[PDB]
Amino acid sequence: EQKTVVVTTILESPYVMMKKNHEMLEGNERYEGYCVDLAAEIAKHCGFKYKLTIVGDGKYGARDADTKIWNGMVGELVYGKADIAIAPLTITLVREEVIDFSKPFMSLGISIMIKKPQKSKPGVFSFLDPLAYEIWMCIVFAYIGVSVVLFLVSRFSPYSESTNEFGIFNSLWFSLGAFMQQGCDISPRSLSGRIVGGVWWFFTLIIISSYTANLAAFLTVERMVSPIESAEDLSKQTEIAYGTLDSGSTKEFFRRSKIAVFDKMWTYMRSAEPSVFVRTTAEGVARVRKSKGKYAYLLESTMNEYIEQRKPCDTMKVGGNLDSKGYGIATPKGSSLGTPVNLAVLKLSEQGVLDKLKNKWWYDKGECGAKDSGSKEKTSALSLSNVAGVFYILVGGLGLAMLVALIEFCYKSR
Amino acid sequence: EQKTVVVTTILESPYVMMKKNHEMLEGNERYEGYCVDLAAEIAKHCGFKYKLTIVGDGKYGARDADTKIWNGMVGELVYGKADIAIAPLTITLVREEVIDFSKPFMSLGISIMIKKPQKSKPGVFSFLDPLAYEIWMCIVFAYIGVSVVLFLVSRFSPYSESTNEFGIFNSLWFSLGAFMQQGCDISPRSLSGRIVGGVWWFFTLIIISSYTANLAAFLTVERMVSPIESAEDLSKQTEIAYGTLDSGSTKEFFRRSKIAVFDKMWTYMRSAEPSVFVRTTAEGVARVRKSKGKYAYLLESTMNEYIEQRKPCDTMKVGGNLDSKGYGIATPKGSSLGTPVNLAVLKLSEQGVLDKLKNKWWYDKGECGAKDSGSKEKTSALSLSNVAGVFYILVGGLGLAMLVALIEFCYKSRA
Amino acid sequence: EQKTVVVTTILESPYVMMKKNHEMLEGNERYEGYCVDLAAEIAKHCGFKYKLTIVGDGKYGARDADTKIWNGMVGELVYGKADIAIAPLTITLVREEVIDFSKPFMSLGISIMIKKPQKSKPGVFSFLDPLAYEIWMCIVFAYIGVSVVLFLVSRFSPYSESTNEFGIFNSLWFSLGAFMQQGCDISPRSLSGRIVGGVWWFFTLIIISSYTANLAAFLTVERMVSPIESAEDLSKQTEIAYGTLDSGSTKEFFRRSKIAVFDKMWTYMRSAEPSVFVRTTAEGVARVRKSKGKYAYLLESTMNEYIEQRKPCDTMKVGGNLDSKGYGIATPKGSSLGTPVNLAVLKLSEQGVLDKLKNKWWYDKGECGAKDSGSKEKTSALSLSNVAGVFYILVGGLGLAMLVALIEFCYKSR
Amino acid sequence: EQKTVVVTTILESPYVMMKKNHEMLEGNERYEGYCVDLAAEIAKHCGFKYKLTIVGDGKYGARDADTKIWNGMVGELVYGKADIAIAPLTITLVREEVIDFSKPFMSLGISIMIKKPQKSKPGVFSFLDPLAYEIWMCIVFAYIGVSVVLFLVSRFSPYSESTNEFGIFNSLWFSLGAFMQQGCDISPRSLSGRIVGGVWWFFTLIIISSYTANLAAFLTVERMVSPIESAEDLSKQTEIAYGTLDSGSTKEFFRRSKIAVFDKMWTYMRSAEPSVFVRTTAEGVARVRKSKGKYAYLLESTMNEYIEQRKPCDTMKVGGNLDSKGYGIATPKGSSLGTPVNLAVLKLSEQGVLDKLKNKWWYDKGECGAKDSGSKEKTSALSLSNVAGVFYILVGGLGLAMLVALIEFCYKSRA
């Protein structure tokens, strides 16, 4: 008369959590979580008796090669260890053909997860950065031209030789002194020269004012670096390594996806030399955190958004997710339990209690309000590294400067 | 053949479009599009003819208030006006209850679209913008008087008037270099003149500082542009506006959902006035183009990402997909052809023709060059264009002095 | 009552709002008195017809002195012209004298409302602001001393005295030109003088850099700053007049209040010139908007909030609530209706419908919601009025400069 | 008769406090405070004898839900161990059904409480703080090296060393003025020297700009601090924690009210651990005092206004009151004292004796009132202290140069 069933589940942290009294409790009491209280609600509607169990394989597990003999979690259904599965498991025809599935309870998709980027060590020459590259070339050519035009106009028969000191060497010297805003030893006596002298002042005044303003702007609200826009970039580059969780349905999806980017990524991962795949969520997390972002991990975004709130907040989503897929309850073929739980799942889908479960197990567990910069940093003094460049230039210049005197003296040695 | 199957259709690119000269063509040949091809695939695989018909009221339709009447294509299905529905009809519970669907053939999410904001190429002389015309003009007038007074004071009968170099031209040349803080070759000696020098120096000290400060502040403000992202801002931002197509089941979803984000959205849309809703997709996207920044629009991501690649290329997606849905071919309740249709759908799926048709229709029409993809977010770099004008001023200045020196020669050679 | 009642009500937008078709709507269907038809729960139980009736005097009503005449609402209740009032009216013993009350449905208090402040025109001399009076003073004494010390040490006996240009006049000239960062031809050429020269350069360098930095910060962020915040300021009031609603029981409360700050306020409000009070909401509103900078108005915080979200969004709450009191139903003494309606108000408080009663009007009409610092209009060009001071100084100095030459000329006339 | 009625009370300032000589005094004189004073007016109106008694567990108490056994003062009132109680217990319906109350004698508001923000005392040389110690150090060495190289290269024979003025001391004088951008009297002649000059010029041009930019940034970040205001954003801020007294009426209010912001507050108060709850006002205040900046507390505003006026003055109100409440004297149901007590309360209210008590217990007690008035420090201006040290450096510099001339005299005076 009486009847009981065995249930399969998995200790996924968003879905099932190990109760502190884990030493001796039964699976119907050992556990709490979205799967646990979903199962309780299902048994409340359908009335059937059950016991919770972990997946005996403790994993999703891969298909047996060349046979597709099922993994632990599916085999426990097919071979009578269990008759119902309530787990975060991907809906697909390659599974629907062997076992029945309920209506999906959630809709979700693949995402990348990456280490949150951090401030890099500043560049040795980064003191140039505000003013952009090309302008320095324009400045150089302008200085040349200005010196030449000054020299010519100064000496093009002002009525004559020796009438003033403006030699070409001295003309370059005047041109250089006028820029860095320093002592002026001489001045153009002639109108055309005073004219040439004039505009160069306005030009330097504007340039310097712009530079000093912009550098001041730069030091406020840094808001920099964004190394990857989407997996597009990850498909163009090859330095950063990546891979899926092993045995995952992502691997089968890529195995047959005809999209050129995804087909290229698949053929690479098939061709990848090191061990790109990870067996566990913990391994996938640790590998990225170890790699300082040099390796990136693919997972269903609903795990990422759970880990995102579990401090430290050193991980982030990027990209607009990969696809859309359902999660649902599963049932082996011919099992009488199938439709009486499927109708209960339909009830919950239309009654909306799942929104209560989602609130209870994700949104109430949000912690990391640091996303919105809830606390304001304080500026600190410049490090020596932020200006180090100028000292090398200085000392090198002095070193060169000594050499000239010796070579001049050796020329004048006879 | 028993009878030609009555097909309901609505004009929507790329699903269905009018032919270039449709008025010249056969009634079915009048139309072209993704679904028109698929209709031929259905006719092939199931082995019967079909008749294309435009949906009379031009909408999917919804349940009428307080009457439970059905209008739109669904109305035509529930009242037996047609035999099969061929349109990007989304599958939802409140309609599944009365019409039958094949296996889904495509998956989608909802998306948000906005106008591309600007083309901010700086003006040729915009570096002057901190000071405005009047300040420069008054500086110009002020410049003269200082020299004039210096000259007048410098030259008088010492009751020895030759004992100073402050001629008129030198009295100019002193003052310009003084204003630029470049120093001088000579310094005034009379008590009167030093006062003038002092006040002109003070004037300089104020002006140059003010200019530098203002330019710095201006760039500082520009750094904080902080554009809207991820639609989360629409929980709090209200300077923007947004809305949806009318009679779309998007509206039913929004008014039926209770998720606090989307509850807030429906609360806004239920109460904001004047009506943010729109009756047609064509004028809806035009509403964004007309609103030019103030009104955003919500639509299926498939449509957003079709449109945004079209020739004008003046709009873009923002944020990710809000949810997930799918299309299915639909037919009245108990239509015996429905299972043959489901088999045809399954075979066309397995054959990959669902890619074939999409690969024809989407990628060739991707005529926008997709430049300025945002892959280099300014990097705070001060572009050369922003300062270009000064180089023209410099070159012109140098160009003039040649001609000056030439006429100076022509003078010195005959005076 | 004759199985029929005329509910005393007042048209006030936080509680009752006229329907558009008031030319043809009649009875309760002329309005949306959700603020009443819940408390009418006992009217539902008794089944008597209730008409939402406009208070005859259109005002909260009052009680006279001497004659003790009862006005408006109060009059029509005590004279038996009306029978039940659900009007938003203040609980006070002066009314408990002749009528009785239910438990108050909500609590509120005295509030004060002013026109939102605005940026005035810039000050003529406001260009001085970054350094303040003390520093601007001290610079002068520093300049004096530096010149004096230079003159002293430069004219120790060289061995013949006055072997260099550094007279006192020239010393003042040199030190002034050194302050302004200007070309000075003469040089100390002496140890003590060079020492003195150095420090003055370092001093000016620091001063100027500080000034420019601070002004740069000043232009980035603006804050209007409210001129007053407290009742103490209103006791120290300069010109801004203030007053309560006329005929309002807050006025009698102020007449009753003995506490020294409020007694001083009252004795001012007694001794202020006539027309300091206002009789209606609209009169107070217009007076405040007319008072660009001359008057401030006091009202109940719930009405302040109800206005604060309306258009134009040009008013603000200032300060805290001055007191607290309840609003509740009022009825003639010992009424066979007034007794049981308290049961309705009680159990409606247990049901918590007060939250809906608030939300439907105060929060659904939030309208002019949050404004913050996120994005602003371009700072735009600096106006001439922000620097006008310098031009006056300049032209004044030039005008003076000629005078010295004429008097010098007349001195050298013999 | 009257068997020496027992009054229950809990110690709290200014309500009731111990006498400083309670180690040796006896009777009700062992105490001071608002309520124990008012007890004399109660005895005046009742005509009865009474004794003060300390509440054993020292708290108001709670229903103890899932058990429904009252404790605290309410416990003593329901189990008949307390004849009458006088304490700042607020009247609530969940209490009124257990105990009687007089007319309310005083009105209250709930308040938030925080530590004072520490005053930003300037440093004597804080003007240096933008530029870091190592840079200031290394500038000196670079200045030395440049000067030495300029000297050496200038005076090596030109083929004769008398041909130029660049002596060692003159070489030190050139470089200093060049670094300060003050110009100079003389200019280097040889190509090597001009190279050195240009290098040193570029170096200063970089340094001075960097210094100015950093100082401007440093002030800018400061300005926009925007401290917490009205404290309602404790519903939104999370870096700063806030507490509430155990068993207090507030502990019910946040469970029992259902306004959304207070809902998320109660969710915080439920979830946060170490718990927000505290057993005593004294140690909660101590917790705030030690947990400066990061911690806050909820209390009756009347208590904050008592506490914040004490000599330490390190704490203050923030924001407006949360609600409105009152206090009444309490007694078991149907006590024949109740109506006499209500009459006494009414009389004392009408007589204004409430103020005659209150004035002694707050207005003489206030001993901190220093607030910005007449003028305000915070507006924009820099204080003199913020740059003060430079003036000391200047004065000392001028003070030194006298002695140089004095030793120059002491040399020359015996040539």
Ligand SMILES: N[C@@H](CCC(=O)O)C(=O)O
């Ligand atoms: N292990 C999950 C997810 C794997 C994946 O993301 O592909 C499943 O196969 O159902």
Ligand SMILES: N[C@@H](CCC(=O)O)C(=O)O
């Ligand atoms: N017509 C679709 C929505 C189309 C859209 O919002 O883009 C529906 O029934 O929901």
Ligand SMILES: N[C@@H](CCC(=O)O)C(=O)O
């Ligand atoms: N609502 C107040 C009138 C306004 C006032 O007192 O200022 C009353 O019930 O009397």
Ligand SMILES: N[C@@H](CCC(=O)O)C(=O)O
């Ligand atoms: N004395 C108040 C304390 C209120 C509180 O702090 O929660 C009471 O009766 O509970």
